Structures are given as C-alpha cells and as structure tokens.
Design an enzyme around this catalytic site. Structure first.
Site, PDB file in Angstrom:
ATOM      1  N   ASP A 325       0.851  -1.153   0.000  1.00 60.12           N
ATOM      2  CA  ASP A 325       0.000   0.000   0.000  1.00 60.12           C
ATOM      3  C   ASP A 325       0.905   1.226   0.000  1.00 60.12           C
ATOM      4  OD1 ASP A 325      -3.079   0.372   0.842  1.00 60.12           O
ATOM      5  OD2 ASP A 325      -1.882   1.937   1.751  1.00 60.12           O
ATOM      6  N   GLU A 354       0.345  -1.324  -5.296  1.00 64.25           N
ATOM      7  CA  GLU A 354      -0.741  -0.435  -5.684  1.00 64.25           C
ATOM      8  C   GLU A 354      -0.318   0.952  -6.185  1.00 64.25           C
ATOM      9  OE1 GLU A 354      -3.922   0.638  -2.784  1.00 64.25           O
ATOM     10  OE2 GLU A 354      -5.072  -0.269  -4.399  1.00 64.25           O
ATOM     11  N   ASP A 421     -13.286   0.976  -2.307  1.00 64.62           N
ATOM     12  CA  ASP A 421     -13.235   2.414  -2.465  1.00 64.62           C
ATOM     13  C   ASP A 421     -14.011   2.881  -3.648  1.00 64.62           C
ATOM     14  OD1 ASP A 421     -11.294   3.145  -0.290  1.00 64.62           O
ATOM     15  OD2 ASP A 421     -10.288   1.589  -1.373  1.00 64.62           O
TER      16      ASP A 421
END
Length: 585
Positions: A325, A354, A421
């Site tokens: 992340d 990511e 998200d």
C-alpha cells in the site's frame, strides 16, 4: 515511413528476457507505416563474415496511434546484437539500430542486450498464473464470533446502509466458517485489506504489526484461518502498509513522549520538535496532513529491518503474499531487498503493488510481481458500464495498456471490476445484470488475474464507500444464485482452459457501430475466442478465422459453432451475449 515515430529501448518493456536463452524484443511504429518488421541478429562478439540469424517481428497489437510488433530472439550465447529491417506499405525498406536509420544496414547500427543473467529473468509464482483472488474486506464479510464486536456493532441486515463509522462485527473466525463457500465459488486466494492492530475502523494507521486487531481475532485464529484455507486450496495475501505507521506505533509514541531524547526520532520525518500532534502537522504524513499516519523513513536501516521482521513473522504464520500500500512512496531499494527477503523465505509468496500511474519502474522483475490493474477497470467501466467508449476505443485502451510492461508482469495484473473504495460494478451498470455479466465474462477470459470483490458473485450493489462496504448477504434466497453459478461456470472454464490463464491475447474484431469486440487467447495450439456483443440488440458478425487454426469451434458456454465456412464465421449474438469459442486444441 515516418521514422521519427518508430521506437525501441533495448531494455524495459521493449527488450527483455524470457529465459537465459531468449529475448523478447518489442518495437512500436505509428499505425499504418510499417508492414514487416524483421530482426536480424547475432552473438555480441560474432565476426562480420557471419550472416545474422533472422526473426520476424510479427504485429502483436495496435492502439489509438501505434502499431506494435514483437519477435523472439534465440540467444544461446545469452548475448545478442540486433538490427531491425522495416518495410513500409509501398515497399520502402529501412534499418533501425542504435546509431539510427539507414537504407544501408551498417549505418543504422545495432541494439545490444549485453548479457542475459539467470537471476534477471522476471520469474513469477506458477500458482499466480491460474489464480482467481477474492477481496475480503474483513469487518463486512462474516461475523463468526460475536464476542469480537466493537462497542456499537450494528445488526447484519441487507437493508442496512453503513455509515463511515458503522460496525457490523465481521472477523477472521467468520471467514473460517465461510470457507466452504469460497471453495464452492472456486477461488484460489483471499486478499485482506489491513487486519492488523489499529485503534480505528480502517486499519491504515497501524498501531501494532505483530497482532491481528482484536475486532477480527487473534494469532491462533489467524494461524487456523491459514491452515483451514490452505486445505481448501486458498491462499492468504495480506495488506502491508509499510509507507506510514499509526500514531500509536510504539516508536512514534516514544518520540511523542521524549522528543529528540527518543531513540526513534529519525524513524520518522519531524520538522520541529516538539512533535505537535494537533490538527497542524509538523511531521510528514500519509498525504497532506493526517496526524494519525506519520510517514516512516524506510530508507533508515532500523526502520527497514523492523518491517522486515514484520514480514518474517507473518510468513512464519504461513501467508502466501503481500499486496502493498502506497508502494510508490517508499524507495526502490526497500522493495528490491523486500523482494529478496520474501522470496528466499517463500519463493511462491506473491508481491502485488498499488500504483495509480505507469508502474514500469516496479515491474522490471526486481521489485514486484504485478500491480492493481486500474487501466482494466477504467476501460471495463467505460465500455460495459457507462457505455462511454465504443468497441475500437476499447481495443486501443486494452492494447495500449498491455504493452506498458513485460509480459510476465502483464499476464498477472490484478484485474478488478471494483473495490472497497469504488462503487460496486452492478451499480456502475445501474442494476443491469447483462452489462455486468458481460463485463465478468470478459474479466474471467482476458489476460490478468481476476479479482472478485466480496458479494459480486451473488449480486450485491452500492455506490462508493460506505455503500460498497455493506454487510454481506448470507441467506441463499436473498442472494443471486443465478449469478453465483455463472461465476462458477466461468471459473471452471478459466481453470481448465490453458489460454485463459497462460495464453497471449490478440484482437479479432472491433466494430465501432455494432459495438462488438472479440479476442483470441492462444497457447500452445489452443485458441479460444471470446466474442462479446455489447449492444442491446441481436446483431450478427462475419469474423475472419484467426491465424493459427479453426474449422469448427465449440461455445463453451452453450454448444457447437460448426459455422466456419470459407474463412469466415457468422454468428448471431443475442443482446449482451458473450460467447467463448474454444477450438479443441
């Protein structure tokens, strides 16, 4: 030809190894200028009296503006000097090498791949090539232990619409119970958004990295989850939020307690001491000002070995991967050594990043294996869901993207429809199943690893967070078993049809007006051709038969398309029907 459009690096995405012996060399030209691209090549030391071995760079993709040709160089010396011959549509013929372009060979130059090293061949976990991953968002998947629940857990109802601060009490123990459903569906790995001890709803401000957060359970439960999942054939990939820690992180607390007297002050980026945790930051944070998420100095060797001890620990528990992340705000050095670490402790452990921009720096083979394929999502959104792009704009956006990276990374990007998200895909397709189904029928056949967000298999919905994070629906008769059985259809075809996991992708039909796109995945002699009718209307297509073979092709969804006559196939596709035409090899 327009010579100031043609391009090659002798590295990167445009020349790279697929074994110590073999160089993939990719070349890009403006669309329509080149019709044969040939590669004449020899050992880096061979004498002028040798005539170069030949390799035709066939045309592998075309995009909006470009045309992409791709060849494979046998290199038994693991050292190659090559030159491109480029013939144009009239019959001009030009050579391209490092010194530039000539009609005379030796003025164009050579490109060389100095040596192909055995370590420097991008190697990816075998298992990852046939995976179907299932993003479990843990608070919302299954509450299997009500003694877990955070003070103020609301009640598990399909009607319930979550607040940003709601709790439903989902947990590790509930996943342990839902595992025969995950095995039913047929997934091969489970991805958890961060499950680690953090004092907030959203576990991105990590308080402790060695404990599962009390809401979700504990180490003995995690270990049994690992051990229960592995028995069913499911793997455990875990979020790692190494870019920043939480403000309750032991070290951060010490700096807060002591300022510069702290042993941990340089673990972080502090502007002025004392570290005014207030609204107004005076240390670096996760994005602008976010007091609960100071940025870690991953460059500092002490910080680096701490998170490395963290990796080791979770691999002791037996996890099969990490999904990292804000991977791009921590240094390349950390990820190269992280790679080495993880990959000596478990060779098959997967490392996804990511990054919401061209990830090539990371996808060379020495940092990460794959990254979240945002470009797949922006396309499938625009084609099936919004209907904002037409079939050829799809082909251009698919093909552009495919050629961003080496193949070994490209065959492994996590191809997602949505996430925790984004709003849900059915809701992007405003409840229309047929737009959804076709976009999942593609997703399970295209190049990548399909990543199902929890609940889509069974027909969930939701605008963006928190309506994507809506309690999962466990009741058969309030779940879309029609969809479920359809993900199981497709997964079963993914898992037994080698093109779908291991093959390449060629475009076969793009039609701006009919809005029918069609592609062919092939390995070794096998071809399966996915035809997708993306209009509300029953239409019909002559498709010219693909390069390698097909006289009779079977719809793997239904039944036989023996209608191969005189090099053309004629199909009539009902509204929004895809078709998966295997050839029998």
């Amino acid at each position: 030809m327009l010579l100031e459009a043609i391009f090659h690096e002798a590295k990167g995405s445009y020349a790279y190894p697929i074994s110590e012996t073999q160089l993939r060399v990719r070349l890009r030209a403006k669309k329509g200028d080149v019709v044969r691209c040939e590669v004449l090549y020899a050992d880096r030391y061979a004498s002028p009296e040798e005539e170069l071995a030949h390799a035709l760079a066939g045309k592998a993709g075309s995009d909006e503006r470009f045309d992409y040709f791709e060849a494979l160089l046998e290199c038994s010396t693991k050292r190659v000097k090559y030159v491109f011959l480029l013939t144009g549509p009239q019959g001009e013929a030009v050579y391209f090498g490092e010194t530039g372009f000539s009609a005379e060979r030796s003025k164009a130059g050579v490109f060389q791949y100095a040596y192909i090293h055995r370590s420097e061949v991008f190697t990816t976990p075998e298992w990852a090539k046939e995976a179907v991953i299932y993003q479990i968002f843990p608070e919302r998947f299954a509450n299997g232990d009500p003694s877990n629940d955070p003070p103020g857990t609301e009640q598990w109802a399909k009607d319930a619409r979550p607040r940003h601060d709601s709790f439903y009490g989902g947990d590790l123990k509930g996943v342990i119970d839902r595992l025969p459903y995950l095995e039913e569906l047929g997934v091969t790995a489970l991805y958890f958004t961060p499950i680690f001890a953090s004092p907030s709803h959203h576990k991105y401000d990590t308080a402790d990295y060695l404990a599962i957060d009390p809401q979700f359970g504990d180490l003995p439960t995690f270990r049994r989850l690992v051990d229960e999942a592995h028995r069913r054939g499911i793997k455990i990939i875990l979020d790692a939020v190494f870019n920043h820690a939480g403000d309750q992180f032991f070290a951060f607390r010490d700096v807060l307690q002591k300022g510069e007297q702290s042993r941990y002050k340089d673990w972080f980026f502090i502007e002025d001491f004392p570290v005014s945790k207030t609204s107004r930051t005076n240390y670096e944070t996760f994005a602008v000002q976010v007091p609960a998420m100071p940025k870690l100095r991953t460059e500092n060797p002490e910080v680096k070995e701490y998170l490395f001890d963290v990796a080791r620990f979770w691999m002791e528990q037996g996890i099969d991967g990490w999904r990292l992340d804000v991977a791009n705000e921590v240094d390349h050095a950390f990820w190269r050594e992280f790679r080495r670490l993880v990959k000596s402790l478990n060779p098959d452990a997967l490392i996804v990043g990511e990054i919401w921009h061209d990830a090539s720096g990371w996808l060379m083979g020495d940092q990460f294996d794959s990254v979240m394929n945002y470009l797949f999502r922006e396309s499938v959104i625009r084609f099936f869901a919004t209907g904002e792009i037409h079939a050829e704009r799809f082909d251009a956006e698919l093909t552009r993207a495919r050629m961003l990276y080496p193949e070994q990374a490209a065959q492994g990007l996590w191809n997602l429809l949505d996430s925790h998200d984004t709003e849900r895909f059915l809701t992007s397709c405003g409840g229309n199943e047929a737009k959804f189904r076709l976009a999942v029928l593609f997703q399970m056949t295209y190049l990548g690893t399909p990543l199902i967000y929890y609940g889509d298999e069974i027909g969930m919905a939701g605008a963006t967070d928190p309506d994507c994070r809506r309690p999962m629906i466990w009741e058969e008769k309030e779940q879309n078993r029609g969809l479920f059985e359809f993900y199981k259809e497709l997964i079963r075809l993914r898992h037994r049809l080698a093109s779908l996991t291991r093959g390449n992708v060629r475009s076969w039909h793009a039609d701006k007006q009919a809005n029918l796109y069609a592609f062919v995945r092939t390995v070794q002699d096998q071809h399966v051709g996915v035809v997708l009718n993306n209009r509300g209307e029953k239409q019909t297509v002559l498709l010219q038969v693909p390069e390698s073979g097909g006289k009779t092709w079977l719809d793997c969804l239904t039944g036989e398309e023996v209608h191969g006559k005189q090099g053309q196939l004629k199909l009539t596709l009902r509204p929004y029907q895809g078709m998966i035409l295997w050839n029998g090899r």
